[PDB]
Amino acid sequence: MERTFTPNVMQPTPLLPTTNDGRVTFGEAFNDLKDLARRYQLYWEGTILEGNLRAIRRNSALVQLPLYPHGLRIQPDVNNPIWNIMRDGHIPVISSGFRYFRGGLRLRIVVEGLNSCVWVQHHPDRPSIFSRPIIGRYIAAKDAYRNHAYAAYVQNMSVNRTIEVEVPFYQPGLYGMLNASDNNTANSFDRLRFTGLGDLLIGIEGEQPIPKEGIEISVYYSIADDFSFNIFCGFPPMVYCDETYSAATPDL
Amino acid sequence: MDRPEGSEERTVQTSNVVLGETNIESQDIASKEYSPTWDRLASSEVSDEYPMLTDRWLFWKSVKWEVNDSAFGKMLVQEKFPQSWVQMDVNVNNIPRYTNIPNFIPFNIHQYMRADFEVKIYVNPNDFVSG
Amino acid sequence: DNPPDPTPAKFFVPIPSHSWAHGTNTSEPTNTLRLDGGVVGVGRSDDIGTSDTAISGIIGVYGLLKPFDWNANDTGRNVGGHLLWSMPVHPQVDKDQVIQVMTQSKLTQYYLPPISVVSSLYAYTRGSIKYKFLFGNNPRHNARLLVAYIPGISSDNRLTLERARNSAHVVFSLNEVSEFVFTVPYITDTMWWPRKYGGPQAAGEFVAPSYICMFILNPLVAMESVPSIVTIVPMIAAGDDFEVAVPAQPAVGLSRNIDVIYPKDSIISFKSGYFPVYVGSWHSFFDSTKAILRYGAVSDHIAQLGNIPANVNRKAFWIVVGDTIKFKTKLDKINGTEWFIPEGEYTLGYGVVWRDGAYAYMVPYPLTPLGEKIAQYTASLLASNTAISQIRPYIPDYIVDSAASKDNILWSPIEDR
Amino acid sequence: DNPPDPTPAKFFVPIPSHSWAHGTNTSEPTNTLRLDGGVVGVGRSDDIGTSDTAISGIIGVYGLLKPFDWNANDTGRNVGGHLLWSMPVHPQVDKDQVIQVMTQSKLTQYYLPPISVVSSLYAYTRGSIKYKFLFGNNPRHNARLLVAYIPGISSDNRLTLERARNSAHVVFSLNEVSEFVFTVPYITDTMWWPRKYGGPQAAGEFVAPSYICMFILNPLVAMESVPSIVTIVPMIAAGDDFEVAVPAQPAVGLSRNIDVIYPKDSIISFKSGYFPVYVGSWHSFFDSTKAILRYGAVSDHIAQLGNIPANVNRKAFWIVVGDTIKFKTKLDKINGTEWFIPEGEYTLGYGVVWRDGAYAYMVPYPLTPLGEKIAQYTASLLASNTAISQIRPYIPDYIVDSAASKDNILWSPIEDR
């Protein structure tokens, strides 16, 4: 099989004795990318002010969040230092080498600055066809308000400011597409219902005003236990993080 | 060449087609091979199979690459698969038709389809080139 | 019945969340958004494989490295003892040994092999590496190569065939053979070796432990009815003994978005009235045979750079950020190197600062991987106060004045190995 | 004795509530408002059955669909090859194949079958569907029908008997038989199929995968001492192989309160001084044979619409929200359709915007299910810049000026499949 084809081997020395993927020297093993994809990373983070929400905030949504195992399309700007120099996390880098998947994701919503209550819904039959989130007053009514019968969780910030949920796989097909394009008209159906786990909506439930500094919502994510990165195609070409901010100014 | 006949040519037969090869191949498999089980959950209508038609090795495109248009990464073929192959018989207006090729004749009367594929690439150079 | 329960209360410590770091060998409490409240997992079948994230199966797949030509008619290079190809040995490949795509004002795209991609996710690495060499030959071509693994060496500064034979090496014969693999050893003074490329501002970076070099033993021979050039395509994969230690900030990012915002505090430009600029010549700089940026045709009208911050490394060269210009330059092959710039029109991508007293001037360089190397080397020569006469061959030549810029040109500090 | 308990405290994570999503296969801690503090549950007997919420037992019950007449004396329609009845196949029935009740300014009430109601609670669906056909005949009537299931087709645009016979189909004989069931297959390229109707603003909606069509093989025959019309009542239930996947926002709501508040931001009306309005004619619009809304009897006094927001879809027609008017119109049967409006007095329920330069005018449509369809089709024709002469047959005719409105009339944007 050509991908691993090694003809006419010329090997001067014997192989190097094993450490069981680090288990001999350190106390743990490192043999599967799936394990690393289960270590949380930043999915999206933003600040929301009263001006971003509807004039009359009738317990409306704060964030409409599309759920992709390969993460969102990052926007590196002066306001987002992480995406600019850290770029994409490990999970989007891992995901890029595989075509398909079939599992769920585990999220962690951290809301700071708000004394009210937060509601979270999962819309598996309504996933976005764009790789960017929708904020506040730009969210359509169909999603801006709590829908019935969807799997949900409602949490008071007074008890805990961190929400922990696991989003399931509810798709009509065999696989979900990894690394999908937002420019897709020839296969809209694939992009619409065979790509994302369904939008996750994060809203507020109370009359408390938002501080002038605003509230900050940080969504971390990771792969669930039933998740699988399925068919290994090539890796795409990469960029180097050390080529964002140069070492010509070692401290900056 | 050491015989009256040139030498022995290996043979590969499928349906009523016979392919000859003379050298050792380069091979690979896109993904793990398997027998499908969830296709039965998609359609209650009995799935028809036409092995003598479909299991037939069929000839695709010939593409001509020259020295003057052969650069690193030059794409001799970039085709949607198997779309481009099954739809290779077009009319005056470049509209495909499944009606003439026996291998594709089941595609005309069925709405949904599935199969595994194999692709052979044949080049017959002389003894004095490199690439 | 309502019996009291005076069992003593237990001390407990409240924390807002469960582990953020753990990814294996533990349970994770969570609120599953399902109708079934038990331990639930999506259904499967043979239609859907198991996860193919086993590292060894990934890094075993060969990736392509920068190919090179091997010309049988080159009576200068095609001789015994000649170094055809060489680089440090480490899982991430050197950037200049990998296929690239550059974009003006954006980041470079690198085609990293699977072993390189995976390694950039972890801090340490170790084991043998399989270097497969593919030759574009036919039964007429013949040669013998000596490829060696030099432990504890990072460059070819002291490297000769007659020294390379004194380390672990192999001798390959190209007699009707087109592929062979050189599985190189792992020879280190320690058990794990730190990755070379790390994070922003060279965070956690280090160097490679060893060197691989290909020498010409018996030169390539062809005939008149056969191509005189044989291309060589190097490929790389992990040996069966390869391992990766410790999760760290990925050295890499995807190429879906190659945009980048360089720090505004490091940006430099030309003083007001000293722009627009164009590429030209003036007498007090190698008798006006070399290229510099001018702001006018009167002489001693050489564009001056604004204030250059003191936190900028002395050996650093510069890269253009905003709009730029095209200019025609050339550079003749430098002794002891394969460094030359053919005469052509190039975009302005790099610059090196030439200081003359209280005035600072900028020297233009082409937006090309070789232009990046020559610019860096020149900046280093200015750093060691090298003779003005010895830096001369590393500076692009003056051919003709080029177009002017729309306005000022912005530059950002960078530095390479 | 008072021994210390230095047992280490455990880390615990505080959360305000238990699961909101879980409905099965788990316990739920709660504060029961009872005197008995154990696991308590209300008493039972045979007088009180067990819960009858088993889905299969619900969706197995047949629901009635829109009936239709089958006239033996219609020498035009009652012929071989004629399409009597057809619709897409999906668990929710198409809205126009279900008994309706409309209310001015309110929501329409639909009489959905059990399989349709239950399916609107879930996101996915699959399996066979039982279509029972009930005929109002007696032993004199005779015919033969061909009913077919066409996979991958959503409309009858390319549908003929001589094509329908080339898919899964059945042939029914009406010879002293009044009931028969056509259990149609499930033929899809995937395992679950997304529901068609979803939520507000067509949230999560999609299309049906297949089509069912009833063709006339051997035309209906009656005699002189027997009714010449045979009514056909279609009914629908789930097959034994039917299943429903995933809880979602109900596509439906109860009809106890059919009130609705349309978004104020989408509302449009006539400019001041351009109302009250009435239905009439003017010359520059098909020689004043078609109906439009005027604000006076002087000519070129055609009611103008206020500012129409740019976020309104181009193919959208409109529905009256507040008070309205009655008007007498008609429309002759359109070629290739069963579309006709008999001459009668109808309430104004729908409108289509006719643009003439910087002026926008409104065309009236009757508050009737067929008027809804013709209005939508007309709006679509204006969208594709169809010939003014070819949109003419889809516009209600002018008979006589109608009463005026009390004041302005308010309209809201809507759009159908």
What is the three-state SS of chain C? CCCCCCCCCCCEEECCCCCCCCCCCCCCCCEECCCECCCCCCCCCCCCCCCCCEHHHHHCCCEECCCEEEECCCCCCCCCCCEEEEEEECCCCCHHHCCEECCCCCCCEECCCHHHHHHCCECEEECCEEEEEEECCCCCCEEEEEEEEEECCCCCCCCCHHHHCCCEEEEEECCCCCEEEEEECCCCCCCCEECCCCEHHHECCCCCCEEEEEEEEEEEECCCCCCCEEEEEEEEEECCCCEECCECCCCEECCCCCCCCCCCCCCECECCCCCCCEEECCCCCHHHCECEEECCCCCCCECCECCCCCCCCCCCEEEECCCCCEEEEEECCCCCCCCCEEEEEEEEEEEEEEEECCEEEEEEEECCHHHHHHHHHHHHHHHCCCCHHHHHHHCCECCCCCCCCCCCCCEEEECCC
Q: What is residue B23's three-state secondary structure?
A: coil
Q: Is D32 exposed, middle or buried (0-12, 13-18, 19+ CB in 10 A)?
A: exposed
Report the DSSP pairing between strands C142-151 and C168-173: antiparallel
**If you search the block for the tokens 């976020």, which residue do you land on?**
D311
Neighbours of chain A (3+ CB pairs under 8 A): B, C, D
Interface of D with C (CB under 8 A): 5, 7, 9-15, 19, 21-26, 247
Q: For residue C372, give Cα distances in angstroms to C111, C408, D69, D359.
A: 18, 22, 83, 63
Structural contact between residues A63 and A202, judged by C-beta atoms closer than 8 angstroms: yes
Note whether B45 contacts D151, CB cutoff 8 Å.
yes
**Experimental technique:** X-ray
CB contact under 8 A, D151 and B38: no
| Residue C153, C-beta contacts closer than 8 angstroms, at least 6 positions apart | C159, C210, C211
With 0-12 / 13-18 / 19 or more C-beta atoms within 10 angstroms meaning exposed / middle / buried, residue C279 is: buried
CB C212 within 8 A of CB C80: no
d(CA C34, CA D43): 30
What are the tokens at A84? Answer: 């600019």
Q: In chain D, what residues touch C16 (CB-CB under 8 Å)?
A: 13-14
Using a CB-CB cut-off of 8 Å, the residues of chain A touching D192 are 172
Task: State how far the Cα of A174 lies from the Cα of A171, in Å rounded to an integer.
Answer: 8
d(CA D64, CA D235): 5
Cα–Cα distance measured from residue B91 to residue B96, given in angstroms and rounded to the nearest whole number: 7
Encoded amino acid at C212, one letter: I
Note whether D67 contacts B: Cβ–Cβ < 8 A: no
B55 half-sphere exposure, CB direction, 13 A CA radius: 9
From D118's Cα to the closest Cα of chain B, the distance in A is: 21
What is the pairing mode between strands C179-184 and A9-10?
A: parallel
Q: Give A113: exposed, middle or buried? Use CB within 10 Å, 0-12, 13-18, 19+.
A: middle
How far is B34 from C49, CA to CA, in rounded Å? 9
Element (H, E) at D368: none
Two structure tokens written together for A150: 């969807």
Closest-CA distance, D23 to chain C, in angstroms, reads: 5
Determine contact, residues C414/C318, Cβ cutoff 8 Å.
yes
Q: Tell me if A195 sits within 8 A of A101, measured CB to CB.
A: no
* Chain pair A-D, CB pairs under 8 angstroms: 79
Cα–Cα dist A168/A127, whole Å? 13
Sorted by sequence, the CB contacts under 8 Å of residue D314 that are 6+ apart come out as D383
Residue A25's alpha-carbon distances to A30, A127, D132, in angstroms, are 12, 45, 73
Residue type, D401: D
Among candidate residues C123, C59, C68, the one with its CA nearest the CA of residue C96:
C68
Cβ C366 vs Cβ C398: under 8 Å: no
Q: Which of B26, B28, B38 sits opposite A174 (nearest CB)?
A: B38
Instruction: Return d(Cα D102, Cα D93) in angstroms, integer.
Output: 18
Buried b (16+ CB within 10 A) or exposed e, C246-266: bbbbbbbbbbbbbebbbbeeb
C42, C44, C46: best mutation site toward chain B, by most B Cβ within 10 Å?
C46
Interface test with D, best of A108, A120, A125, A165 (most D CBs within 10 A): A125
CB neighbour burial string for C367-403, b if at least 16 within 10 angstroms, e if fewer = bbeebbbbbbbbbbbbeeeeeeeebeebbbbbbeebe
Sign of the alpha-carbon dihedral angle for B27, B31, B35, B41: negative
- Residues of chain D with C-beta less than 8 angstroms from the C-beta of C35: 21-24, 247
Q: Which residue has the tokens 């006339």?
A: D216
B/e letters for A7-31, b = 16+ CB within 10 Å, e = fewer, are eeebbbeeebeebebbeeeeeebbb
Q: Which of C265, C399, C251 is nearest to C329 (CA)?
A: C399
- Residue B62 CA to residue B120 CA, distance in Å, equals 12
A186 and B CB contact within 8 Å: no
How far apart CA C173 and CA A198 sit, in angstroms, is 58
Which of these, C62, A227, C43, A230, lies nearest to B31 by C-alpha position?
A230
Is residue B38 within 8 angstroms of chain C, CB to CB? yes
Question: What is the number of CB-based contacts under 8 A between chain A and chain C?
Answer: 343
Cα separations in angstroms, D95 against C172, D113, D122, D161, D375: 77, 12, 18, 25, 16
Residues β-bridged to residue C109:
C101
C22 HSE (CA, 13 A, CB side): 10
Query: Could you tell me if A156 lies within 8 Å of chain D, comparing CB atoms?
Result: yes
Q: Which amino acid is it at C73?
A: N
The rounded distance, in Å, linking the Cα atoms of D275 and D271 is 7
Among C394, C386, C118, C415, which residue's Cα sits nearest to residue C242? C118
Q: Which chains touch C (3 or more CB pairs under 8 A)?
A: A, B, D
A230 contacts on C by Cβ (under 8 Å):
48-49, 51-52
Q: Where are the alpha helices (DSSP H) in B2-93?
A: 51-54, 83-86
Q: Chain B contact for D28, CB < 8 A?
A: no
Of D128, D166, D189, the CB nearest to B112: D189
Distance separating alpha carbons of residues D265 and D280, to the nearest angstrom? 29
Asked whether the beta carbons of D404 and D325 are under 8 A apart, the reply is yes
CB atoms within 10 A of CB D154: 16
DSSP codes joined into one string, D214-254 = EEEEEEEE--TTS-SEEEEEEEEEE-TT-EE--B-S-S---
Asked if B27 has any chain A CB less than 8 Å from its own CB, the reply is: yes
* Pairs from C278-287 (Cβ < 8 Å, separation ≥ 24): C278/C325, C278/C327, C278/C401, C278/C402, C278/C403, C278/C404, C278/C405, C279/C325, C279/C327, C279/C329, C279/C348, C279/C364, C279/C398, C279/C401, C279/C402, C280/C398, C280/C401, C280/C402, C281/C398, C285/C354, C286/C392, C286/C395
Distance CA C167, CA C327 (A): 47
CA separation for the pair D28, D280 (Å, rounded): 66
The 10 Å Cβ neighbour count of residue D202 is: 12
Tell me the two tokens of residue C398. Answer: 């003056």
**Considering only CB atoms, which chain D residues are within 8 Å of B109?**
166
The distance of Cα D214 from the centroid of its chain, to the nearest Å, equals 20
**Residues of chain D contacting residue B112, judged by C-beta atoms under 8 Å apart:** 151-152, 187-189
How large is the C-alpha radius of gyration of chain B?
19
Residues 6 or more apart whose Cβ sits within 8 Å of residue D264 = none
User: Which residue reads 């006589």 in tokens?
Assistant: D400
Q: Report chain D's C-alpha Rg in angstroms.
A: 28
In D, minimum Cα distance to B40 occurs at D191
State which H helix or E strand residue A36 sits in: helix A33-36
Contacting residues of D for B111, CB less than 8 Å apart: 151-152, 187, 189
CB contact under 8 A, B27 and A231: no
- Using a 10 angstrom Cβ sphere, with 0-12 exposed, 13-18 middle and 19 or more buried, the burial of residue C315 is middle
